[PDB]
């Protein structure tokens, strides 16, 4: 099957955020450089099973792409994509907590929703995501999962 064309835009936006050229993303997915260009522009369709390959190449689990797409479908843009730098920084701590803390591993529900909820808590507290550390995130994460 084929996906919405907007996955190409999502990949192009994320590729740029990751500071990867099309050539580097090719040497990270096995898609030719020209094929990456064609996916991004909508000249070729992206496979359902191809997003998995892109996620690995971008260093991102595929659900994040799927979650971003669902926002486009509802709102006509993605607030998460538009603020991805903050999402990525919070996600780094969420990912660490999930893979290193048994209480989080076995109590987490939806890691995407939890990353968004943690960002909302920081915004309420007027805290910059660049100023936090893992210990602090883990305290907030345990609280949202309580």
Numbering used by the authors: 8 to 153
Paper passage:
Therefore, we determined to solve the structure of BovI-Stl by eliminating this region and dividing the protein into two functional and complementary portions corresponding to the N-terminal (BovI-StlN-ter; residues 1–156) and to the C-terminal part of the protein (BovI-StlC-ter; residues 175–267). The initial four α-helices (α1–α4) correspond to the DNA-binding domain, presenting the archetypical helix-turn-helix (HTH) motif observed in multiple repressors, as well other DNA-binding proteins. We named this portion of the protein the middle domain due to its localization in the Stl sequence. The structure shows that the N-terminal and middle domains are closely connected by helix α5, while an unstructured region of about 20–30 residues connects the middle and C-terminal domains. In the model, BovI-Stl recognizes the DNA by inserting helix α3 of the HTH motif into the major groove of DNA. Our model further proposes that additional residues such as Q29, S44, N48 and R22 could mediate the nonspecific read-out of the nucleotide sequence by interacting with the DNA backbone. The first three residues coordinate a sulfate ion in the BovI-StlN-ter structure that could mimic a DNA phosphate, since superimposition with the C.Esp1396I-DNA complex places this sulfate at the position of a DNA backbone phosphate.
The Staphylococcus aureus pathogenicity islands (SaPIs) are the prototypical members of the phage-inducible chromosomal island (PICI) family of mobile genetic elements. Stl is a DNA-binding protein that binds to the intergenic promoter region between stl and str (the SaPI transcription rightward regulator), preventing transcription of the str and downstream genes, thus maintaining integration of the island in the host chromosome. The remarkable ability of the SaPIbov1 Stl to target unrelated but functionally similar antirepressor proteins relies on the modularity of this repressor.
